[PDB]
Design an enzyme around this catalytic site. Structure first.
Site, PDB file in Angstrom:
ATOM      1  N   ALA A   1      48.245  -1.255 -19.034  1.00 20.86           N
ATOM      2  CA  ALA A   1      49.548  -0.768 -19.407  1.00 20.86           C
ATOM      3  C   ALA A   1      50.143  -1.732 -20.514  1.00 20.86           C
ATOM      4  CB  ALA A   1      50.589  -0.918 -18.236  1.00 20.86           C
TER       5      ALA A   1
ATOM      6  N   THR B   1      44.803   7.721 -14.563  1.00 17.06           N
ATOM      7  CA  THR B   1      45.091   8.120 -16.009  1.00 17.06           C
ATOM      8  C   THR B   1      44.120   9.105 -16.505  1.00 17.06           C
ATOM      9  OG1 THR B   1      46.176   5.994 -16.497  1.00 17.06           O
ATOM     10  CG2 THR B   1      45.826   7.564 -18.300  1.00 17.06           C
TER      11      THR B   1
END
EC number: 3.4.25.1
Lengths: 241, 195, 232, 222, 212, 245, 204
Positions: E49, E1
């Site tokens: 997430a 990420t």
């Protein structure tokens, strides 16, 4: 009638219950705290007496809640015991928490919230007691307050509660000298106590007394509940004995 | 990483605190506020464990403000310092900790003396006019006190503090990205620029 | 005396309570429904009420499940607490045991729940009658639930206002509808005749009819408008 | 000591059509190197255009599936016979999973089904909460296999056009129910031959706006 | 990420990846890593997430409840601080949070707060959060200008995703651009990293390792 | 006697008299009218003025419950405070769980479910709210699966859908007038001037905007509470229309 | 070992003959870092003196703790708390937590007024009666002090004799300990008079 729970109101927008607690004071003893710049005196009168009553090695209407603040009692004595113990516990919380002695305004303020709480919540009595608070804090010096049975406080320089409050008050405010002295407090208190009381010769075994002074043995406050023979000395000056 | 400095001069308490905050191997910003005013004349610099400094700082600030506002006159640095210490002393005996070391530098109006206290992460209130925590106190216990003249002023203490900072960058592999110096006096609390 | 008109924890000299008796009153002021059943179907026909002609009428049929359902006659507040409870039990039986809750078995749980409030001094006692239909392993069944908690299995029954004429339709034609099986059309028509007589100084309208049907071949479905202007 | 968690395998594949949707899965269940079942799928009918397979651990799935089904029922009750649409159903499911981010589950759920736009949608979940809207997702053990192939032929990605030498890409092409069927037949077969948790049969529920259809294709027992 | 954000005069540019990685496998190549909190506030999804998704929409329930109760638009500061309280309670439960709350309102100017799951609320102007937040800082800090145009600000965040995507092992997919004005986030389209990389290679004269 | 003291005592009607009395609380309250059309629902209210110091435009009586839901109210604001805070949470919680609009009918169920509490405990319902609710709301919104729907949440029973419903002191005369003047041919603008036409008749004060407040539910617009200028304009069009006929 | 060992610090109390001495060091350290060269470990509630060794937090916290209980005792009964009775109290109060036990080794000393007899008592983490009429020593240099005090003690001593014995004791034992020293202070309770004599000693 309104009498069933304290969760109701009479048409004065108060409660009849509060009036009943008020009246409880005016069948107990008389209580007077006179403040001066040089010390505060607390005084109470005994509402029972005998000669086979132990009252010469004890007091009952005078408790120190910490070594800087003291209280007098007027009302029923049965009501008194519970709330004294709680004020004293609150003081030692203050001492534990902040590393210093409680202010007079809070200690009284708490106690006043708690009385109102039993009015506010439940069908549990109001506690018909009036306490005279005489304290010291290094923020407003000497402080004299009293606490209502309704549960509010108001500051003072002299006050009387107990029996014949009105009679007593007029007499106290007449003879109040404006600088004042702890010695004059002590002197005034005996004189005022006499006339309300139903005895014509007021006596020391019929007296409870504490004088609070920082004006001698300065830099520290020492509170002294008087012993019986000392009370006798001050009576001899006022010419009663 | 994360230093807090303190000096008591004879008219002010001078607290300094790092502008640097590191989470991971990343410096998140080179400008970070890491000192909060409890009331307008008592200041808490604070440093310590990851994100406990933030939760604990706001928790303590709010309580002191409530009591200052409640009494209707701001509490002494003496009242303030026991309270903060007592929260910490409960926490290590509770099932959730906070391990945050702090300094209280107030100007006490009650007796007219500046007051620097050293409050441990452990939760130990002791008064010291050269206190300091983490890895700072390993260098500045000795630096302050060598140069320390028994009477002090705001002027004298600031040059000596700047010097202290100048040693720390050199002998730690750290970066504090300078330090902000907020000065606590009888006129309230102010920010003044330094190395 | 009628010192017992306040106490629901204290027996009345007759052996009743007045509170339980008043609860039957509530049903009378309540809105009419006629039940009836056969082996392979069960039907509820209920009257919708209105306070005016800008009202879009009160649901008198609540779907409890896709195979069970109920109607009401009496206090709508009390009807809500027990409807909640009732769906919670039918879903419980489908969750743990992969099972349909029997009409009769559901009714015994509702019984303890009425009498709990009679035993207690806390919260309202009930004052609505529920006509319950379901179709389980033991075919269609019709229970009349009372706010006492008494549950009564009949071939046809009625509660609500002016419900004594529904019992008279049902008594006469008791056997006609035992013989009909497999024709949902017939059983629906029989409730409609029934509730014309029940009512007095009223007439039925299209949007006053709510007919709720479940059986062995008919899924749980509610018919409104054009699906009930075929049996008026 | 004990560990309460384990696997039971299987592999699933959802694809959103343009007017259709498919959800597929093998009939094999496993425990270690035995085979529990040769004719139990994990795509289950929940209704209202929702086919749901929670493929992973059989225990984690069998609980969630029932609880979800029960939630659909309480939609009808509270909301007086309104459809709980597929999109909205997805937020629900995420919240149940989040319910058990305090006792963690080990399933890749895919729901698949028809939207209100007359076009299918595949929503695919994390075993602890969150979801995203996908065109192709394979869940389950042999997930790694089935994806390089799905990208190539259902989004036409990592592909180009001749005569420009990669300076024009191969664009999207309108997917048809027959096209994905053939794709689905060889995808699950390729899986059989190069993985050992997928096998025996194939059960594909097809979601249209004219009901739920079953199509069964057998697989090898290797 | 790699998620990153930076304030500029004309608003806040929030540039994100799209790559989701689980293990050494790729979980998805489509996943929006911006959660749209309400039509004025954007948060981001990095860390867990699941955590970021639920709590930011929940965050959205608090935002909506605030407007309904008082009829005043929430502060940027009000929202972050509330997510600071919320994440601390659920601390010690395996919780994660690596979200930047960004918005620009008429009473506070552009503002960005970092929230961390350790109870951290950190003020800044430039933040980057993720695994590859480091790469995002190197390029972005050095070409950072407060006085900067919208077309150029956009270009800058894009290029921060492109260099960060390239040299990290967990990032890429596509480049999703959002610009928060005073009237909230505006979508600026989806740019695939794959094709995009090649046009930028030429324009700049950068990324000198590959020729196509 | 022992019938109006107690929430667990029914009378010879098989009812509570706790429940009865709360209707009469709404009739105490100011007049509020809602009128449904297929264009949007229009929610009008009455306020009162007895002092020139009373600011009545700086406190609310039409409130937003979501972003397409509005409510009008009548009765005590104390009973209303609990009801609307509750109703705010129900819509908000819905968006959390599904990520969709709340339906109109289901919002009504929740408000009447609070209403049910009159006492202290019950099996299948914990009760913590110890009196009747002396407030009702007209609940108006939009779902997509029906249309625009307008409901009356009753504190004393279950909920009754209306196409136009009046509550408050002047409820009685308003209800007759709406039967003879609500029609499905009437546009958005007509809906506004209808409410003000009824509103004045049972007002004991002149028609003015410091005692009035209209609003509409238009899904396209979101729930919009109006300005003062718009209402002032419309009092004038109402009087000019009726001056000429 | 324990936390009491990490922070350290010594409080030693002793008996002579119608007298006590209770003395302490001025070192507070938190591990390797020395923290204060001046934190006194002697506190008092009336005539009863409470020393506290151990971790730095519990020195401040327990002090507040035992203050609270001696203040309710004092007011209600209108007399001073007695060292004989305080020994009972310390042991139960510390025992209240056993599953979070306070990590300290206190020393109680005072002289009873209801007989004039000298009292010293020793405690550990959760405290036990340990009776002496000789000496109780505590801390990280307690093993040094146990022998040092025995060695110099001669039974039956003057108030002035007892000063000498406790001073020489502290002087070398604190010095030859890592985590102890850094100044000392000696309280000689003669009967009801307390003289305070600061020991000039080096900074450790």
């Amino acid at each position: 009638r309104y009498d069933s729970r304290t969760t109701i109101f009479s048409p004065e927008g108060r409660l009849y219950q509060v009036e009943y607690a008020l009246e409880s004071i005016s069948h107990a003893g008389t209580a007077i705290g006179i403040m001066a710049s040089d010390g505060i005196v607390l005084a109470a009168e005994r509402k029972v007496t005998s000669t086979l009553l132990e009252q010469d090695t004890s007091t009952e209407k005078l408790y120190k809640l910490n070594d800087k603040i003291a209280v007098a009692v007027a009302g029923l004595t049965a009501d008194a015991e519970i709330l004294i113990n709680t004020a004293r516990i609150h003081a030692q919380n203050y001492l534990k928490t902040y590393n210093e002695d409680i202010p007079v305004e809070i200690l009284v303020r708490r106690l006043s919230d708690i009385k109102q709480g039993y009015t506010q919540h439940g069908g549990l009595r109001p506690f018909g007691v009036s306490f005279i608070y005489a304290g010291y804090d290094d923020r407003y010096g000497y402080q004299l307050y009293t606490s209502n049975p309704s549960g509010n406080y108001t500051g003072w320089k002299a006050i009387s509660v107990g029996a014949n409050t009105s009679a007593a008050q007029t007499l106290l405010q007449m003879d109040y000298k404006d600088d004042m002295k702890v010695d004059d407090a002590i002197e005034l208190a005996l004189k005022t106590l006499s006339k309300t009381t139903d005895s014509s010769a007021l006596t020391y075994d019929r007296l409870e007394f504490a004088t609070i002074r920082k004006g001698a043995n300065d830099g520290e406050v020492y509170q002294k509940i008087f012993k019986p023979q000392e009370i006798k000395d001050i009576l001899v000056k006022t010419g009663i004995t | 990483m994360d230093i807090i400095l303190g000096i008591r001069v004879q008219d002010s308490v001078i607290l300094a605190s790092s502008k640097a905050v590191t989470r991971g191997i990343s410096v998140l910003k080179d400008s970070d506020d890491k000192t909060r005013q409890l009331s307008p004349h008592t200041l808490m610099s604070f440093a310590g464990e990851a994100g406990d400094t933030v939760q604990f700082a706001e928790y303590i600030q709010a309580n002191i403000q409530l009591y200052s506002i409640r009494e209707d006159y701001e509490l002494s640095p003496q009242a303030v310092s026991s309270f903060v210490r007592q929260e910490l002393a409960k926490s290590i005996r509770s099932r959730r900790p906070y391990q945050v070391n702090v300094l209280i530098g107030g100007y006490d109006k009650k007796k007219n003396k500046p007051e620097l206290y050293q409050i441990d992460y452990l939760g130990t209130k002791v008064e010291l006019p050269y206190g300091a925590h983490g890895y700072s106190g390993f260098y500045t216990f000795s630096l302050l006190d060598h140069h320390y003249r028994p009477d002090m002023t705001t002027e004298e203490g600031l040059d000596l503090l700047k010097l202290c900072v100048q040693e720390l960058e050199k002998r730690m592999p750290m970066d504090f990205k300078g330090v902000i110096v907020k000065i606590v006096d009888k006129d309230g609390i102010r920010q003044v620029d330094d190395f | 005396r009628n010192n017992y008109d306040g106490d629901t924890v204290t027996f009345s000299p007759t052996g009743r309570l007045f509170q339980v008796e008043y609860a039957l009153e509530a049903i009378k002021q309540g809105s009419v429904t006629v039940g009836l059943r056969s082996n392979t179907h069960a039907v509820l026909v209920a009257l919708k009420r209105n306070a005016d002609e800008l009202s879009s009428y009160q649901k008198k049929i609540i779907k409890c499940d896709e195979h069970m359902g109920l109607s009401l006659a009496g206090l709508a507040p009390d009807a809500r607490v027990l409807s909640n409870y009732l769906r919670q039990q039918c879903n419980y039986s489908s969750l743990v045991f992969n099972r349909k809750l029997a009409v009769e078995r559901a009714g015994h749980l509702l019984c303890d729940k009425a009498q709990k409030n009679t035993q207690s001094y806390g919260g309202r006692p009930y004052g609505v009658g529920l006509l319950i239909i379901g179709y389980d392993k033991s075919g269609a069944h019709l229970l009349e639930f009372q706010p006492s908690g008494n549950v009564t299995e009949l071939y046809g029954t009625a509660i609500g206002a002016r419900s004594q004429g529904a019992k008279t339709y049902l008594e006469r034609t008791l056997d006609t509808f035992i013989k009909i099986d497999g024709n949902p059309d017939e059983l629906i028509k029989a409730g409609v005749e029934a509730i014309s007589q029940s009512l007095r100084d009223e007439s039925l309208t299209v949007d006053n009819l709510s007919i709720a049907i479940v059986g062995k071949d008919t899924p749980f479905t509610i018919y409104d408008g054009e699906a009930v202007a075929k049996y008026i | 000591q004990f560990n309460p968690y384990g696997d039971n395998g299987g592999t699933i594949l959802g694809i959103a059509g343009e007017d259709f949707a498919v959800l597929a899965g093998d009939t094999r269940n496993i425990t270690d190197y035995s085979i529990n079942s040769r004719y139990e799928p994990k795509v289950f009918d929940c209704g209202d255009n929702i086919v749901m397979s929670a493929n992973g651990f059989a225990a984690d799935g069998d609980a969630l599936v029932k609880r979800f089904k029960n939630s659909v029922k309480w939609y009808h009750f509270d909301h007086n016979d309104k459809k709980l649409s597929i999109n909205s159903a997805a937020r629900n499911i995420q919240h149940l999973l989040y319910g058990k981010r305090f006792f963690p589950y080990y399933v890749h759920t895919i729901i698949a089904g028809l939207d209100e736009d007359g076009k299918g949608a595949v929503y695919s979940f994390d075993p602890v909460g969150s979801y995203e809207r996908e065109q192709c997702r394979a869940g389950g053990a042999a997930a790694s296999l089935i994806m390089p192939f799905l990208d190539n032929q259902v989004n036409f990605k990592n592909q180009y056009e001749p005569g420009t030498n990669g300076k024009v890409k191969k664009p999207l092409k309108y997917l048809s129910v027959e096209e994905v069927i053939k794709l689905v037949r060889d995808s699950f077969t390729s899986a059989t031959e190069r993985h050992i948790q997928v096998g025996d049969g194939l059960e594909i529920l097809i979601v249209t706006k004219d009901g739920v259809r079953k199509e069964f294709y057998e697989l090898k027992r290797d | 990420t790699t998620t990153l954000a930076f304030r500029f005069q004309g608003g806040i540019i929030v540039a994100v990846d799209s790559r989701a990685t689980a293990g050494n496998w790729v979980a998805s190549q489509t996943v929006k890593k911006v959660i749209e909190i309400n039509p004025f506030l954007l948060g981001t999804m990095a860390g867990g997430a699941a955590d970021c998704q639920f709590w930011e929409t929940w965050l959205g329930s608090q935002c909506r409840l605030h407007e309904l109760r008082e009829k005043e638009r929430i502060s940027v500061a009000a929202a972050s601080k509330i997510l600071s309280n919320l994440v601390y309670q659920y601390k010690g439960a395996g919780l994660s949070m690596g979200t930047m709350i960004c918005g620009y309102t008429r009473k506070e100017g552009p503002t960005i707060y970092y929230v961390d799951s350790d109870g951290t609320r950190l003020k800044g102007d430039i933040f980057c959060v993720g695994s590859g937040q480091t790469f995002a800082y190197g390029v972005l800090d050095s070409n950072y200008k407060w006085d900067l145009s919208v077309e150029d600000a956009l270009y800058l965040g894009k290029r921060s995703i492109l260099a960060a995507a390239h040299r990290d092992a967990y990032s890429g997919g596509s480049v999703n651009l959002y610009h928060v004005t005073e009237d909230g986030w505006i979508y600026h389209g989806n740019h695939d990293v794959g094709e995009l990389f090649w046009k930028v290679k030429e324009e700049e004269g950068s990324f000198n390792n590959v020729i196509g | 006697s022992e019938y109006d003291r107690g929430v667990s005592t029914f009378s010879p009607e098989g009812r509570l008299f706790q429940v009865e009395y709360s209707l009469e609380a709404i009739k105490l309250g100011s007049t509020a009218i809602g009128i449904a059309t297929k264009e949007g629902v229009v929610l009008g209210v009455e306020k009162r003025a007895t002092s020139p110091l009373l600011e009545s435009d700086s406190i609310e009586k039409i409130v937003e419950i979501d972003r397409h839901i509005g409510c009008a109210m009548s009765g005590l604001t104390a009973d209303a405070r609990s009801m609307i805070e509750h109703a705010r949470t129900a819509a908000v919680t819905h968006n959390l769980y599904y990520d969709e609009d709340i339906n109109v009918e289901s919002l009504t169920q929740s408000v009447c479910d609070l209403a049910l509490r009159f006492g202290e405990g019950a099996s299948g319902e914990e009760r913590l709210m110890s009196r009747p609710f002396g407030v009702a709301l007209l609940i108006a919104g939009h779902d997509a699966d029906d249309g625009y729907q307008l409901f009356h949440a009753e504190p004393s029973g279950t909920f009754y859908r209306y196409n136009a419903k009046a509550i408050g002191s002047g409820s009685e005369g308003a209800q007759a007038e709406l039967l003879n003047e609500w029609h499905s041919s009437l546009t958005l603008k007509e809906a506004e001037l209808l409410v003000l036409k009824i509103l004045k008749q049972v007002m004991e004060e002149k028609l003015d905007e410091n005692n009035a407040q209209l609003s509409c539910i238009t899904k396209q617009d979101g729930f919009k509470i109006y300005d003062n200028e718009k209402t002032a304009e419309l009092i004038k069009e109402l009087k000019e229309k009726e001056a000429a006929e | 070992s324990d936390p009491s060992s990490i922070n350290g610090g010594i409080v030693v109390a002793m008996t002579g003959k119608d007298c006590v001495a209770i003395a302490c060091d001025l070192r507070l350290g938190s591990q390797s870092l020395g923290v204060s060269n001046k934190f006194e470990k002697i506190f008092h509630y009336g005539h009863v003196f409470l020393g506290i060794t151990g971790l730095a937090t519990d020195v401040t916290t327990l002090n507040e703790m035992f203050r609270y209980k001696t203040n309710l005792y004092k007011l209600k009964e209108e007399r001073a708390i007695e060292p004989e009775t305080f020994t009972q109290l310390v042991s139960s109060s510390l025992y209240e937590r056993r599953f979070g036990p306070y990590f300290v080794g206190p020393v109680v000393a005072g002289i009873n007024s209801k007989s004039g007899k000298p009292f010293i008592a020793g405690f550990d983490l959760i405290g036990c009666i340990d009776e002496a009429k000789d000496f109780i020593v505590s801390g990280t240099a307690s093993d040094q002090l146990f022998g040092m005090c025995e060695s110099l003690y001669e039974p039956n001593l003057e108030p002035e004799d007892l000063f000498e014995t406790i001073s020489q004791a502290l002087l070398n034992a604190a010095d030859r300990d890592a985590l102890s020293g850094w100044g000392a202070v000696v309280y000689i309770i003669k009967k009801d008079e307390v003289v305070k004599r600061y020991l000039k000693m080096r900074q450790d």
